[PDB]
């Protein structure tokens, strides 16, 4: 499953970069670990002439420093920094400012310790806030600019290979590139898909041209053996990313499988390797995105810790404690998979309550294992 | 059993109290409930629109009516 | 009793209520007056609280008796629905809900949160609005403003006073004694203040908490002066927890009284000495009720600034809570100057000074003559599968054709593109659509319609195609769509018959093709169609599926129509959605294959799919002609179709 999901894409991207004349391919933090492993294996086997490098970063480590001369209005939009708040800690963290330092400017905010829209508005209305954020950003940008200048060779014709996103992170990183190299630096990003046109120096090469949402695959990438890069630091006069490691077992097995699959996949007798990449990708993405009762999507994928599972099975009392879709999303990231994993009585109760609580309609059947059925012990 | 003509418009008499539908499907949600075709009244039919199957519907300025011979009659 | 008047609104309030009470008192012999509530419980509440007996409710047997032969229907709004049995010649006395200098009704446009409701209201009841609504105007300025913002007949205007501002005077009407609601008798304060703030949009903390943070200091400053501070916040403001908290903390205070909204505050205007207002229309009402001391408490004047409030509102300015306290304690607020009150009263209620009375208003109404005009209708038409169709029926047939041309031209294409052209192109279109939907912020626009150029740009940029390939494919699709056009002659001739009857007709279509390609297709179906107005989604950016194209049509045309009918094939875009906008729909069925034809087409690969489309469409045309042209019976049709196919 994970090979079909990743390897054909990386193959397409590597071949497309060789075609477009890219000399170096950079893989960005977290999402780029497995993808760079795959690309290295492909280049080794096929003997392609292209270098690969790994770059550490993240939204948190790159958004604030990207504010060169202005704070992006996107920061105050539906997908800005004040998006996803669930508690007061979430609000204080999105604000960039401490609870005390923030409540000093917004006493009205002392309460609650629509709402998000008004919060974004009040944030947008303060020029002092804008200038303070700009100062903080110009200060945090020193280490990011030095990291870029030390890790990325600007005299080459290079590109970046990601997996999924809106494209705003790519825009901020391209702004950081321009500030670090002092010129209009074309940054092309490879995605499986993105929802935005080319903007400024950001160029976007997309693998699949279909209205599919690949956030689905975030759990797999979240098995990378270290947390999201929070920021940078300096030692030995060199800038380095803060890396707080995690256990390597899951990522070890995932990389084992991915490289086995790469070997097996490059050995296939294809009449047209590009067409097979495209066809296998189409089939595999369609299947994994529209098969919530699949044995392995149920028993393996949806059980990956994201630490709580991505879409675990549901219990009758858990559904008795819900009354909205918001409350249920806190319980699982995929209602179809969770239901396909739950007992028949749970499914029947969900059906009973869905018409009233306005929950998505469950249109699948319980998962039936297909191979290694029953306990093998 | 269906009353219709290739030559539109054409007058029809309402044998029974006939309802108006805003969709050839004659689905409940498309049946008008604000007004109806009174029994023994006449009305002009300005178009004949056919379902996917083989049943005709007679369009009036207020919506579709049935073509069944027990409910309408060409004048 | 000669005349019969019903009065209606969503609440026991307003000019409807004022005039209703004044007539039930001073017009018991010349008019029979009833109040129609929206439901039964509303009537029960009104009757329990007021003891009147001339109260019925909508669709009540009393209402079904009165409405068919009533004389006047008094309202404070352009109602969203009117009783279907309401008499043909009734006089809709629309006594508006306030005067001011803000846009309303049709002026709110398509960006308004009430756009759908406005379109529904007007599409439904334009005949009533234009031929039966006597709108009450109070001054020439207000009459001009309202005639600009609304669709009312200048001949049916009624000039006079606002009944709710001139009926509950000292010796006038009162359904309740004010002293029974106050801690002390009204003469038991040094004065009374009425605080009427407005519901502000962006409210981190409750609108009330931001305006009046510390109620303890307010009550202290009111005791020190022996004032009665009466708080009547906006309706939505009453939902906040701070409102209820402060109402409970001072539920039995001698100076801070949270007005019980179960009573009409207008009845008490004559008892109000001071008014603390911000941006609400009620100010003018107060000015018309005799109030003369005004405090404009506008802490949020920074927002409304940078855009005249100064010249058309009275009241000393106070922007800070501390300033409001200093003003309430200082007791330095003079009565409105004679010249300024004369100015404002002229500007806003000039037609008042014409010695206008309540009975004068009732006479002007009753003595009015309805001279209605017969209005034209509007008829919009879907294009694809309504006025025109495809010689191969299914849309994807086009794509098939295009692929076959690509693969046959000699220009080399990528295998993934040729062999999989159907999926490639359809999924690229839906991809571009999702991109539009997800980039409404980045584009600062709610329009989300795509164009053919967007689809082929996506394809070219992400498949690394040459300009030759992309232009070949795009021109092939355009030329194929044009060459496969066929007319649906009966609906075209019906459209033009409608136009010849004097109705206005137009076409509203959701399609990515450019407007010129659409016009070429129409011209190949029927040249006359080129002269009909066109609302193409690709040109406008709004679609019928979202209903936005219907709103655009409503606000773009000079809507003067007695009825709107939409003819189409889509159960949603041309049915559900338009019906939600109050539009009468005539939705027919799209052409479609039957089992044998479908299986034939579905059984072919790339080499044989287009001719299979041709043959299946020929079979469909044959059975169509047999059943719905020649009028054959079941057995004859079945025999002929079998022998053929
Ligand atoms: Mg259509």
Residue numbers in the entry:
A (entry chain B): 650 to 762, 770 to 962, 970 to 1040
B (entry chain A): 1041 to 1115
C (entry chain A): 0 to 306, 312 to 649
Please share excerpts from the published article on this structure.
The X-ray crystal structure of the capsule polymerase Bcs3 reveals a multi-enzyme machine adopting a basket-like shape that creates a protected environment for the synthesis of the complex Hib polymer. Supported by biochemical studies and comprehensive 2D nuclear magnetic resonance, our data explain how the ribofuranosyltransferase CriT, the phosphatase CrpP, the ribitol-phosphate transferase CroT and a polymer-binding domain function as a unique multi-enzyme assembly. The Bcs3 protomers build into a physiological and functional head-to-tail dimer, which is assembled primarily by interactions between CriT from one protomer and CroT’/CrpP’ from the neighbor protomer, with an overall basket-like shape. CroT transfers ribitol-phosphate from CDP-ribitol, generating a phosphodiester bond with the 3-OH of the nonreducing end ribose of the Hib polymer.
To study the location of Hib capsule polymer in Bcs3, crystals were soaked with oligomer fractions having a narrowed degree of polymerization (DP). A structure was solved by molecular replacement methods (3.6 Å maximum resolution) showing Bcs3 in complex with two complete repeating units (DP2) of the Hib capsule polymer and an additional nonreducing end phosphate coming from a third repeating unit. Bcs3-DP2 crystallized in the P 1 21 1 space group, with four molecules in the asymmetric unit. The overall architecture between Bcs3-CMP and Bcs3-DP2 is essentially preserved. However, we observed more flexibility for the CroT domain in Bcs3-DP2 than for the CroT domain in Bcs3-CMP. DP2 is clearly visible in the electron density maps and is present in all four Bcs3 molecules bound to an SH3b domain (residues 1,037–1,115), with the nonreducing end facing toward the active centers in the main groove. SH3b domains are the prokaryotic counterparts of the well-characterized SH3 domain family. The SH3b domain in Bcs3-DP2 revealed a completely conserved fold—a compact β-barrel, formed by two anti-parallel, three-stranded β-sheets. Notably, Bcs32–1093 and Bcs32–1068, in which the SH3b domain is disrupted, were completely inactive, strongly supporting the mechanistic role of the SH3b domain for Hib capsule polymer recognition.
